[PDB]
Amino acid sequence: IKIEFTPEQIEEFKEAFTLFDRTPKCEMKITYGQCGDVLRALGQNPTQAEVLRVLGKPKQEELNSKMMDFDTFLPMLQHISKNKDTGTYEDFVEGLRVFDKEGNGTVMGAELRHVLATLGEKLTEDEVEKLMAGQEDSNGCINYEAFVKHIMAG
Amino acid sequence: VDAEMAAFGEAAPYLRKSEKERLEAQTRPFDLKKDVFVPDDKEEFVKATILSREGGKVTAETEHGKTVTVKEDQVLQQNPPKFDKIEDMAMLTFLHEPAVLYNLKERYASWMIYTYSGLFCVTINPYKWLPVYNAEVVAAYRGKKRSEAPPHIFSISDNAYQYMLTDRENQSILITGESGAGKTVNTKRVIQYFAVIAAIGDRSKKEQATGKGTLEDQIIQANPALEAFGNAKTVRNDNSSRFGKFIRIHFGATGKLASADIETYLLEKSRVIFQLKAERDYHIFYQILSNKKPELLDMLLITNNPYDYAFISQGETTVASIDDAEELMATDNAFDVLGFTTEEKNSMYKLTGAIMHFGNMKFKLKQREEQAEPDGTEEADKSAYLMGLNSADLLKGLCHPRVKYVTKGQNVQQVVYAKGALAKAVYERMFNWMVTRINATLETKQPRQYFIGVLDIAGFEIFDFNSFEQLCINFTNEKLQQFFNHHMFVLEQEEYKKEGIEWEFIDFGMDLQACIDLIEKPMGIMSILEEECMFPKATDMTFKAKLFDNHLGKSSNFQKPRNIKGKPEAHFSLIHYAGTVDYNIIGWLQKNKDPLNETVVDLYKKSSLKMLSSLFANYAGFTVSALHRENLNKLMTNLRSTHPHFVRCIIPNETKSPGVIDNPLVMHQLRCNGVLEGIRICRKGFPNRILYGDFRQRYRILNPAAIPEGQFIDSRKGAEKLLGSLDIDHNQYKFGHTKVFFKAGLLGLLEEMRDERLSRIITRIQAQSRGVLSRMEFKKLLE
Ligand SMILES: Nc1ncnc2c1ncn2[C@@H]1O[C@H](COP(=O)(O)OP(=O)(O)O)[C@@H](O)[C@H]1O
Ligand SMILES: [Mg+2]
Numbered sequence: 001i002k003i004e005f006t007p008e009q010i011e012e013f014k015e016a017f018t019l020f021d022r023t024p025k026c027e028m029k030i031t032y033g034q035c036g037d038v039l040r041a042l043g044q045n046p047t048q049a050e051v052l053r054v055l056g057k058p059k060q061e062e063l064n065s066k067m068m069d070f071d072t073f074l075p076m077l078q079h080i081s082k083n084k085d086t087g088t089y090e091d092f093v094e095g096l097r098v099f100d101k102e103g104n105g106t107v108m109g110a111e112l113r114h115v116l117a118t119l120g121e122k123l124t125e126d127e128v129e130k131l132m133a134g135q136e137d138s139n140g141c142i143n144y145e146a147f148v149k150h151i152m153a154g
Numbered sequence: 155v156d157a158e159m160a161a162f163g164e165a166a167p168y169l170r171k172s173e174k175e176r177l178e179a180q181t182r183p184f185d186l187k188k189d190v191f192v193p194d195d196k197e198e199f200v201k202a203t204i205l206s207r208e209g210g211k212v213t214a215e216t217e218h219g220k221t222v223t224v225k226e227d228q229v230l231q232q233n234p235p236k237f238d239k240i241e242d243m244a245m246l247t248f249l250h251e252p253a254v255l256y257n258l259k260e261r262y263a264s265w266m267i268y269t270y271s272g273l274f275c276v277t278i279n280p281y282k283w284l285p286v287y288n289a290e291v292v293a294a295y296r297g298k299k300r301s302e303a304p305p306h307i308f309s310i311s312d313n314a315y316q317y318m319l320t321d322r323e324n325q326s327i328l329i330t331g332e333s334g335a336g337k338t339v340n341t342k343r344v345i346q347y348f349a350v351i352a353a354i355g356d357r358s359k360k361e362q363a364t365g366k367g368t369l370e371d372q373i374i375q376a377n378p379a380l381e382a383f384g385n386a387k388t389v390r391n392d393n394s395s396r397f398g399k400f401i402r403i404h405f406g407a408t409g410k411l412a413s414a415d416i417e418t419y420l421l422e423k424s425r426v427i428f429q430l431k432a433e434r435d436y437h438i439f440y441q442i443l444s445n446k447k448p449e450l451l452d453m454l455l456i457t458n459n460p461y462d463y464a465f466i467s468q469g470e471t472t473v474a475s476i477d478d479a480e481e482l483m484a485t486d487n488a489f490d491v492l493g494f495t496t497e498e499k500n501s502m503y504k505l506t507g508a509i510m511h512f513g514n515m516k517f518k519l520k521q522r523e524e525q526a527e528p529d530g531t532e533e534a535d536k537s538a539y540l541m542g543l544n545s546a547d548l549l550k551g552l553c554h555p556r557v558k559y560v561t562k563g564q565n566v567q568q569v570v571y572a573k574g575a576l577a578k579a580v581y582e583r584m585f586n587w588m589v590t591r592i593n594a595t596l597e598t599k600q601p602r603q604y605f606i607g608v609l610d611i612a613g614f615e616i617f618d619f620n621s622f623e624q625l626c627i628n629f630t631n632e633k634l635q636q637f638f639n640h641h642m643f644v645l646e647q648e649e650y651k652k653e654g655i656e657w658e659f660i661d662f663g664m665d666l667q668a669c670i671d672l673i674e675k676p677m678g679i680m681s682i683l684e685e686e687c688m689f690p691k692a693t694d695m696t697f698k699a700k701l702f703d704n705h706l707g708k709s710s711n712f713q714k715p716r717n718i719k720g721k722p723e724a725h726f727s728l729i730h731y732a733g734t735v736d737y738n739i740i741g742w743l744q745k746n747k748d749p750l751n752e753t754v755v756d757l758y759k760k761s762s763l764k765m766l767s768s769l770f771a772n773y774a775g776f777t778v779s780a781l782h783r784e785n786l787n788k789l790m791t792n793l794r795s796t797h798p799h800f801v802r803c804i805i806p807n808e809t810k811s812p813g814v815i816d817n818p819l820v821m822h823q824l825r826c827n828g829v830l831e832g833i834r835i836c837r838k839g840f841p842n843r844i845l846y847g848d849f850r851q852r853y854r855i856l857n858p859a860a861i862p863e864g865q866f867i868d869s870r871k872g873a874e875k876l877l878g879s880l881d882i883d884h885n886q887y888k889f890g891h892t893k894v895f896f897k898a899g900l901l902g903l904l905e906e907m908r909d910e911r912l913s914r915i916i917t918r919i920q921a922q923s924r925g926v927l928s929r930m931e932f933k934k935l936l937e
Contacts (some may be wrong), residue, residue: 020934037553037928037931040924040925040928040929041928041929041932044925045921045922045924046921046927047917047918047920047921047923048921065729085553086918086921086922087914087915087918087919088858088859088862090858090859091855091858091915091918092915092918092919092922093858094855094858094864094913094915095912095916095919096856096919097855098855099212110571111715115916116919117917117922119913119916120913120916120917120919120920121917121920121921122920123920123923123924127923127924127927129891129924130927131923132932138824150926151919151922151923151926152922152928154925154929154930
């Protein structure tokens with residue numbers, strides 16, 4: 001694939017790539033599993049399916065053991081950057097609106113915890129708890145649309 | 155029991171389940187693309203989960219864990235769990251055969267016997283008395299609209315009564331279904347409901363006023379009287395109505411009960427003298443023989459044994475559910491409440507006893523002759539005594555009838571046939587007289603303003619052997635279905651006009667016209683039978699030949715009998731709305747003519763028993779189809795002056811088993827009763843229709859850009875924008891004044907697209923939520 005990043009930007013990706021290198025040998029090689037965290041730190045938001053798709057469908061043991069260099073990571077970052085369909089603010093609010101039974105503008109705490117952990121690409125019980133850091137109201141009662149502002153600015 | 159259900163008391167769970175109970179029963183995994191319906195040889199349809207779709211054939215795992223392979227077209231979609239045990243089936247996303255079957259049988263399993271399907275009130279026989287008909291329930295249905303309470307027959311009764319008062323017009327409640335489906339049970343409940351709630355009119359005693367108590371009492375006492383002479387034990391039902399009935403309940407000003415009148419149809423005369431091995435004759439015979447009123451055995455000169463009487467002991471003689479002794483008490487009581495005199499009551503009993511002795515009179519061939527003569531006279535002596543006739547004149551008249559000065563000759567078969575034909579004519583004329591008599595009592599001074607007509611008649615059913623009687627009832631049901639179809643057509647046309655939808659179609663009633671025209675129009679099936687009856691040289695073959703030469707080519711609905719090894723002899727086949735019926739033409743000319751020995755009839759006219767002479771006073775000889783045509787025109791004219799309401803009774807199984815559903819049997823009934831027919835004709839229009847406001851609230855997730863987020867916006871324009879933007883058939887919907895109109899299936903797609911979008915958006919919310927967790931474990935690494 002054709003690379004469209006400027007030479008000054010290639011070094012900006014190479015400097016971020018080094019921060020993820022946990023090796024004491026400093027070979028500048030990261031596991032197929034930590035690959036996603038690099039792309040997320042680079043201001044991108046890919047799905048777990050898109051993560052496993054660019055790696056050519058890896059196995060569970062390949063994500064923990066198989067290593068990867070910067071020359072092979074770059075054509076994959078080019079593929080994620082070209083994706084424009086990340087979902088508008090309106091799309092995100094509409095999805096949570098389905099779970100607003102009362103039609104007031106607030107979804108119950110326990111419901112949102114269950115939705116994000118069962119529907120779609122499920123989030124871990126710890127990933128759910130860490131996301132609801134800023135908590136809910138006295139009854140809880142989570143103001144969606146305001147929660148969309150929170151997760152798209154963080 | 156939820157607060158909305160508190161008014162219903164003990165009835166509440168037999169009418170609607172609690173929200174808690176609903177959500178818990180509805181929580182199950184469901185994939186809108188894997189969970190389907192597949193055909194079945196034994197069960198008609200089964201639920202299944204798809205596995206693979208390789209080469210035009212779908213491979214799936216059914217309930218009962220079996221793996222099957224079926225054609226892609228043969229797979230049907232399930233309605234989501236949201237839709238389980240729904241109250242009105244017109245609201246379902248998918249309205250196909252298994253969608254209707256499963257919603258009804260799932261409610262039935264929960265002991266909820268009433269369901270709506272558009273206009274129809276569907277009821278499945280529970281074979282168990284449920285606490286849903288008490289005064290507490292009557293009180294909970296008063297003044298409520300259909301949607302304001304769960305389905306029930308009391309909703310039909312109360313709304314018919316309310317519509318009558320509000321719209322100032324006549325009403326009808328049309329109750330059909332097979333034998334043992336529940337027509338009698340529901341007809342009785344409807345009539346009792348009106349007696350409980352109708353206003354009280356002018357009760358001051360008229361000059362020739364007969365009867366005990368009130369018009370409410372009398373209307374209700376009409377049923378045990380009619381049941382003794384018109385009801386019998388059959389294989390399908392222990393208390394089967396062998397006649398059709400239309401009761402018009404007249405109301406004066408303000409819902410004041412004024413009068414009532416009953417019209418009866420196609421009484422099974424053949425039963426008087428004949429019974430199938432597993433069936434009884436009319437109840438009255440066994441009621442008398444019970445010896446509960448011993449003075450009656452002495453009066454009819456009869457024994458207490460049904461087996462001593464050849465007309466009534468050919469099949470069964472006793473019924474599990476029937477106490478004939480208690481039943482005689484109730485019958486005799488009904489006649490007294492209805493104002494019948496001692497003379498009238500004793501005359502009916504005497505004429506019933508006379509019929510019994512008639513079947514016992516034996517005949518023998520005269521030596522070296524083909525002429526019959528009496529083989530004993532004792533039973534003919536007992537008959538003539540009761541019928542107020544001369545024994546010898548009766549026996550002479552039977553063996554040697556006078557015809558157009560010429561004294562004819564009769565053999566043993568000819569006399570046996572003629573005494574049976576006479577016994578059946580007396581019985582039928584006495585039943586018709588009794589209905590006329592009951593009608594005379596069901597009167598008050600309160601003037602007639604409106605009526606509610608309750609029709610209880612056998613539904614369209616295809617049997618192994620279908621003769622003239624079947625054509626008559628099938629013809630009635632054709633006309634009745636056309637009345638339903640035209641009513642639905644008018645309702646739809648009124649809705650599209652009001653909402654300004656330029657839909658154009660022929661009356662759904664026109665879809666049954668060709669069959670009706672084949673049966674009733676000049677040179678049709680009835681016209682040919684009537685024409686062949688006028689020629690004495692005619693036979694069943696001359697009639698069969700006429701039907702073929704007149705219709706086997708230019709009449710589509712007419713065709714050759716599709717005879718198969720198993721089913722008996724057929725002569726032609728008819729294409730009715732509910733399927734194809736194979737008719738056998740043997741005896742139709744004789745059935746239609748109903749020939750009677752007119753020498754014995756002249757004796758009946760000159761009888762010393764006033765009743766007997768009254769019944770034959772206006773007898774004429776030289777048709778059944780002509781009378782049926784007249785009575786049906788009269789019924790239709792009455793129905794077309796009313797706002798109709800439709801009740802569909804379904805028999806769940808053939809074994810009187812509570813809670814058990816036989817899928818093929820329930821399916822056959824759905825195909826024949828109008829339920830599936832109503833779905834078909836509505837599918838021609840716009841079956842699904844959503845308000846602009848409600849569409850915007852549910853389908854904005856499909857393209858939120860088309861309906862931008864605002865504090866004030868025009869919903870018609872917004873819905874117009876959203877639908878136009880989607881990769882959809884833009885000819886599968888129309889825009890109304892307050893609602894969007896959809897073709898069948900379009901909504902099944904809009905929901906598939908909605909769940910595909912909601913799953914994609916949650917995935918993107920989760921991927922964006924992963925980004926803030928990644929940036930928080932990076933803002934901690936950097937700092
Ligand atoms: N709603 C009902 N509740 C309880 N039992 C019923 C109900 N409907 C019918 N049955 C039972 O089934 C029998 C047959 O019903 P019936 O009304 O006589 O049928 P039909 O008139 O359609 O032949 C009844 O005598 C009764 O035992
Ligand atoms: Mg009955």
